[PDB]
Structures are given as C-alpha cells and as structure tokens.
Amino acid sequence: LQYSRKKLLIKSYEQCEDEDLLMTVCKSVTFQEFCANEIKSLLAKFLYGFKIYGSSNVYKLVFVILLEDNNGTINGVQVEMMSDFKRLSGAFKNHVIENENDLFDCMYKSEEKYFNLYRIKCNHNANNYKSLSLSSNS
Amino acid sequence: KLRTLNVKGQLLTKTTMSINNEDYYLFKFLVNNKSIDYYGTQTQFFSLINNKTYELVLQYSRKKLLIKSYEQCEDEDLLMTVCKSVTFQEFCANEIKSLLAKFLYGFKIYGSSNVYKLVFVILLEDNNGTINGVQVEMMSDFKRLSGAFKNHVIENENDLFDCMYKSEEKYFNLYRIKCNHNANNYKSLSLSSNSQLERLETDDSMFEYEFQYDYTVNISRSNKIIQKHRVTGNFTSERNIYQNSDRFVISYDTANEKIKTSIYNRMENAESKTDYDTSITLKDVTLSQLNSLIESNLVQVDVYLVTDPNNVKNNVIAGITKIEIDGTYEPL
C-alpha cells in the first residue's frame, strides 16, 4: 500500500492462499468471532470449575479471556464453558482422567493457571449470552 | 356417622416418634404429586413399603387423618395420558409427561440454519394450589419436527411453516414432553425423539379453556414475553454495529402503532470462510427490499418479538418469517 493523493492505494497485490489460525493461540478475540461462531484457539486463564447441581453428567468450566470491541479496547472478561464428562476427559492434553474423581482433582490443580485452548468454538444464542463449548476434537 | 375419604398414591417415607410414651406413626404419601402425611399404627409401619402405589382409605377420628385400611395398586403409568395442568415440582423432576397446551405461534430462529422455536400456553399449578396460564417455549430441529406432527407429512422446511400457520391458535395434545429445568433456571419444553404433537381441531370444548390459557408471563425468559406482529407499513432497516454488538436497527408499522427494535446478528457455524461479512450484508439486502414487497403485497412479514411488558422499549426480534403469495415461506 502506498500513501498518495491523500488515499491508501493498493500499489501491488500478491496471491497468498489459505492462512491457518487453528492451533494458533490468539491472545485476544473479537465480538465478530463470536458472531460467525468461528472455531479458533486462544490463550486463557482457568479460574475454577465444578459440577452443576441437579445434573449428573454436566460440568462447568470458568475462564478469563480477552475480548476486543470495535472501539479497539481489550478487556478481560469471564467466559463460561460446558461439556460432559467424556469430552472433558479427552480434552485435557497430557492428562489422564479415568473417573469423575480425577477431573475434580485436575481442575483444582488447574486453578489460576494459564491455558492454551485449542479448536474452541465461540457461540451466540437467541438470548445472546456469549460462551465457549468443546468440540469433539479440542 | 364418622365420614371418610378415599385417595390413591405412591408412598415416599415412613417415620415414627414417641411423644409422652404414646407411639405415633406417619407415612408421607405422594397424592396427585403432593406431600400429604397420614397417620397409622405399628401394624401399618411394617406392612407398607416405599415406592409403591397404595389404594388408600382414610378415616377422621380424634382430630387426625387415619389410614383405615390399605390395598395395593400397581405402578400406574400416565404417559400418552394428557393432563390440563403441571406443577413446578414436575419441572424439577424433569418429568417426561403428556399434557395439553394451546399452540400460539412458531418461527425459525435468526442466524440458525436448522433450529426452530415453538411458543405454547400451558397451565402451571404452583406450590400454593393456584393454576395460571403461562407462555412456554420449545426448541427442536427440522428432523425431529418433520416426524413430530402426528397425521401430517412434513418433508421440507416450507411444509413445516405451512403446518404451524394452519395450527396457529389451536389446541394440541402434547404426548411425552420433557419439562426442563436448567442450571440457568428458565423452564422449557423439549421433544423427546418419540414425542407426538396431535391437534384437536376445536369441537366446542375450547370454550372452557380459552379463559384459562391467558399467558401473562413467559416462563422460558426473565421479565420478558414473546409477542407476534404483522408488518403492514414502513419497514426500515439499518446496520448499526455498536461497541457492544453487531445489530440491525429495524422499525415497522402494525395496525396498532410503530415499533422500534433491533436484531442481534449471528451466523451458525459458517466455517473456515468469510461467510459472515458476505452473508449479513446479503440479509441486509433482503431487509431493504422488504418494504417494496409489502407495499405491492408480494410478501407479508411476520415479526416475532421478545418483549418486556412493562417497558415496551425492551424490544428484540427472535425471528422474521416472510409469507409469500405463492405459498413459499422465507424465514431469516
């Protein structure tokens, strides 16, 4: 791009082809990446996780991530994540979770540590409510 | 004559206590899904067993409700057996259940490509014995909905929409519907993959029921209800992406008044591709064409509005369905 005649003109264009952002951790994400419901990977901070009262097979993970509003400011926000016992056991890379008891013992040893999340989908609902969710290969 | 009552129900707990060396024996029975306690002696304490329907005959003597006698029924099942009213208790147990509802209206949710939403009115008997008609919501997909409707062949989305707009404001027997309660405490209805939605088609028994099914609150949202409007006049659309979200500002005329609202833009699972920027501007084109079509009566627009009753300002759109002259249906 060259600055000429009070404009930004495309001085030359070159063909690039399919840049990959999966398995590439982004320090931040944008509101639009929650809108497109795009599967990315970001770095996050796990706060604390537990099992939902009244449920048997549903656990909740709470994270702190960084969103970018279009104003350009980067804010730390609390995001919530839900997944069953199965998808959670295989989600934790380099950790063996064979029963419910180990999941809780892993979460309590995972508290306040920084995580690289991989292939996590950002969702958006009828009632908005922006949250994360585990795919089958995250 | 000492008068008596007859009740039937599951037994939950058995408890005993000795007050002043006078043994007392009590049985917590589930009668019509209520915790009602009845008196007994030491003979009944051992004869009866928990989680077992007992046909019960009560006696009133010495200012107490006695178990005069016991027989035993056998675990009656009440599915495919419709009910007028459910309780808060049954929503907590997440009881798959068959009850009667009044169908209001249905639409396809914005941004989604295969997810639809139904709005019903059901009778919900609270913990105090009062029965009130409330608005309840329901999510299901095209596949479950294609086979859900009893006695109606639905093979394509356009049929699905044609079956709701016919069934709008009719009464429906809902068979084997799971009443949900969630970590986020809003209560809803769900299609178990083997649930039937069977229409009643009037027959003048409706007169007793329309007075009851007066929805004043939507139990699937908090402080908000869903309302349905017909677009008659100036439909205007504008793209306002704010600091907080990407939105469409929309204002239309009904036969009543003009409404300001806004819809939150979202795209379902558009993958590895810029199918959000190129598709939202696409739907914006569909929106600024709409007024041209309503004037010449080419399409009719139905706006489904998640609204706060007290403050009519809190308006958001959950679905917009275009009714075309030639039977074709376009939702958004």
Q: Can you point out the beta strands (E) in chain B? A: 4-19, 22-30, 35-40, 54-61, 64-70, 85-87, 96-108, 115-125, 131-141, 171-180, 188-199, 225-230, 236-241, 246-253, 258-264, 299-307, 315-324, 329-331
Residue type, A53: Y
A60, containing H or E segment: strand A58-68
B169 touches chain A (CB under 8 A): no
Residues in chain B: 332
Nearest CB among B241, B268, B306 relative to A70 is that of B241
Query: What secondary structure letter does DSSP report for B215?
Result: -
Query: A55 to chain B: which residues are within 8 Å by CB?
Result: 183
Q: How are beta strands A29-30 and B225-230 bridged, if at all?
A: unpaired
Bridge partners (DSSP) of residue B124 are B86, B132
Residue type, B173: N
Q: How are beta strands B96-108 and B115-125 bridged, if at all?
A: antiparallel
Burial bucket for residue B176 (CB in 10 Å: 0-12, 13-18, 19+)? middle
Bridge partners (DSSP) of residue B138 are B118, B189
> Which residue on chain B is closest to A70 by alpha carbon?
B243
Residue type, B28: K
A68, containing H or E segment: strand A58-68
| Greatest CA separation for chain A | 67
Rounded to the nearest angstrom, the minimum Cα separation between A126 and chain B is 7
Instruction: Please state, in angstroms and rounded to a whole number, the distance separating the CA atoms of residues B91 and B127.
Output: 12
Residue type, B239: R
* Plot region of B211 (φ>0 → left; ψ -120 to 50 → alpha; else → beta): alpha
Q: How is residue A123 written in tokens?
A: 């969702």
B70 touches chain A (CB under 8 A): no
A31 touches chain B (CB under 8 A): yes
Query: A128 to chain B: which residues are within 8 Å by CB?
Result: 245, 264
**Dihedral sign computed on CA atoms, order A77, A83, A85, A86:** negative
Query: What secondary structure letter does DSSP report for B109?
Result: P
Residue found by looking up tokens 């960084």 in the block: A66
Instruction: Please state, in angstroms and rounded to a whole number, the distance separating the CA atoms of residues B287 and B231.
Output: 13
Instruction: Please state, in angstroms and rounded to a whole number, the distance separating the CA atoms of residues A25 and A118.
Output: 7
Residue type, B289: Q
Q: Comparing C-alpha atoms, which of B218, B198, B228 is closest to residue B303?
A: B228
Instruction: Please state, in angstroms and rounded to a whole number, the distance separating the CA atoms of residues B136 and B320.
Output: 19
Q: How is residue A91 written in tokens?
A: 């989600």
Instruction: Please state, in angstroms and rounded to a whole number, the distance separating the CA atoms of residues B264 and A127.
Output: 9
How many angstroms separate the Cα of A109 from the Cα of each of A46, A48, B238, B249?
Answer: 10, 10, 49, 47
Backbone angles phi, psi at B285, to 5 degrees: -65, -40
B275 touches chain A (CB under 8 A): yes
Long-range contacts of B123-130 (CB under 8 A, 24+ apart): B123/B84, B123/B85, B123/B86, B123/B212, B123/B213, B124/B85, B124/B86, B124/B87, B124/B88, B124/B219, B125/B85, B125/B86, B125/B87, B125/B88, B126/B87, B126/B88, B127/B87, B127/B88, B127/B89
Nearest CB among B92, B221, B270 relative to A36 is that of B270
* Inter-chain CB proximity A71 and B270 less than 8 Å: no
* Inter-chain CB proximity A35 and B221 less than 8 Å: no
How many angstroms separate the Cα of B75 from the Cα of each of B9, B69, B88, B209?
Answer: 9, 19, 22, 30
Burial bucket for residue B97 (CB in 10 Å: 0-12, 13-18, 19+)? buried
First to last CA, chain B: 70
Q: How is residue B65 written in tokens?
A: 């409700």
Residues in chain A: 138
> Which residue on chain A is closest to B108 by alpha carbon?
A126
Instruction: Please state, in angstroms and rounded to a whole number, the distance separating the CA atoms of residues B309 and B215.
Output: 12
Rg (CA), chain B: 26
Cα angle B85, B89, B33; round to 5: 70
Nearest CB among A36, A55, A126 relative to B276 is that of A36
Instruction: Please state, in angstroms and rounded to a whole number, the distance separating the CA atoms of residues B278 and B289.
Output: 17
Q: How is residue A102 written in tokens?
A: 């180990």
A56 touches chain B (CB under 8 A): no
Residue found by looking up tokens 């599967």 in the block: A39
* Inter-chain CB proximity A70 and B243 less than 8 Å: yes
Long-range contacts of B58-61 (CB under 8 A, 24+ apart): B58/B4, B58/B5, B58/B6, B58/B7, B59/B2, B59/B4, B60/B2, B60/B3, B60/B4, B60/B5, B61/B2
**Helix residue ranges per DSSP H, chain B:** 42-47, 88-92, 142-148, 157-166, 207-210, 277-288, 290-295
Query: What secondary structure letter does DSSP report for B296?
Result: T
Nearest CB among A35, A126, A128 relative to B267 is that of A35
Nearest CB among A58, A60, A128 relative to B264 is that of A128
Give the experimental resolution in Å: 3.5
Instruction: Please state, in angstroms and rounded to a whole number, the distance separating the CA atoms of residues B49 and B33.
Output: 18
Residue found by looking up tokens 């941004």 in the block: B111
Q: Comparing C-alpha atoms, which of B159, B165, B161, B145 is closest to residue B331?
A: B161
B249 CA to centre of own chain: 29
Interface mutation vs chain A, best among B92, B114, B272, most A CBs within 10 Å: B272
Output the DSSP codes for B51-96.
Answer: S--EEEEEEEETTEEEEEEE--------TT---SEEEHHHHHTT-E
Backbone angles phi, psi at B163, to 5 degrees: -80, -30
Instruction: Please state, in angstroms and rounded to a whole number, the distance separating the CA atoms of residues B221 and B117.
Output: 13
Rg (CA), chain A: 19
Burial bucket for residue A74 (CB in 10 Å: 0-12, 13-18, 19+)? exposed
Q: Comparing C-alpha atoms, which of B181, B187, B173, B332 is closest to residue B263?
A: B332
Instruction: Please state, in angstroms and rounded to a whole number, the distance separating the CA atoms of residues B310 and B315.
Output: 11
How was this structure obtained?
X-ray
Cα angle A114, A117, A118; round to 5: 155
* Inter-chain CB proximity A31 and B264 less than 8 Å: no
* Plot region of B58 (φ>0 → left; ψ -120 to 50 → alpha; else → beta): beta
